[PDB]
């Protein structure tokens, strides 16, 4: 059909997310991100290099963990703002400039991680709707990669 991220898809995505999201401890978030990156790496070996500053070769180090926590925080911020797109646009631009001009960071890698999330979420999220999720995950990455290389 349209493939656009609809108001109802957004409601559902906030549900898929809010339920799994631990608002008190990093245990859940952390576990979800690390798993996302393991998958990302195993499908894209060359991608681990882009994370040397955050110790991407050591997913359990204090530095990569803190980074996973930041990625999970960026996604959460975007999933929440799906409800208020005016502000969402400003937040997705900021994220965009945070990934822009980074050697190795391209749209290809975002499509990759998109599939990593599609493989991770169902394992941890109950009542996962892969369709609504991907339609809005893509809405979010599109804003994050507006000025990135293919």
């Amino acid at each position: 059909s349209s493939n656009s991220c609809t108001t109802e898809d957004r409601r559902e995505m906030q549900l898929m997310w809010a339920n799994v999201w631990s608002a008190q401890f990093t245990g859940r978030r952390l576990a979800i991100a690390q798993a996302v990156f393991k998958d990302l790496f195993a499908h894209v070996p060359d991608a681990v290099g882009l994370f040397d500053r955050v110790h991407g070769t050591e997913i359990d180090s204090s530095e990569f963990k803190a980074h996973c926590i930041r990625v999970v925080n960026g996604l959460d911020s975007a999933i929440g703002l799906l409800s208020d797109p005016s502000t969402l646009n400003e937040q997705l631009s900021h994220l965009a400039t945070q990934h822009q001009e980074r050697a190795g960071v391209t749209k290809g890698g975002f499509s990759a991680i998109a599939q990593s999330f599609l493989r991770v979420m169902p394992q941890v999220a109950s009542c996962f709707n892969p369709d609504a999720w991907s339609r809005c995950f893509n809405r979010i990455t599109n804003g994050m990669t507006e000025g990135l290389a293919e």
């Binding site: 059909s1 599609l118 493989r119 169902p122 009542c127 996962f128 709707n129 892969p130 369709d131």
Partner: protein, 146 residues
Amino acid sequence: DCNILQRLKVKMQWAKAYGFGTERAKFGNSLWTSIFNYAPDARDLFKSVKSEDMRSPQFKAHIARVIGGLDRVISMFDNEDALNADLEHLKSQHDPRGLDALNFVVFGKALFATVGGQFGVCFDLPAWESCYKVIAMGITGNDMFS
């Protein structure tokens, strides 16, 4: 083994969990969402029914045919001759697509979660595991369902 008693318990539990009207479409959508979440890669085997958009008429038609099969198949549990004929009829439709038997294991797991989730705490899982084996074995042949 799926003796007669288990077949009856299973027909009774299915009837209750399957329901009437649109409740069936909901049950089906749940069954299939669970299958693709249990094995995200099985989704590719259904390009022919447009599994890219699970809420498309093509896939929804596919969801209805499947639970429709489950229904008629479960309703014949008590008559061996009718049962085996229809299971063969189904195998005939599933062979030319060369399917890995393990997918049918996932399907059964999803079937249990859906029926039990809809039926409640008195869901008889052992009886369901046993009798589902008869359907699986009949459709695939793989003695993994022996």
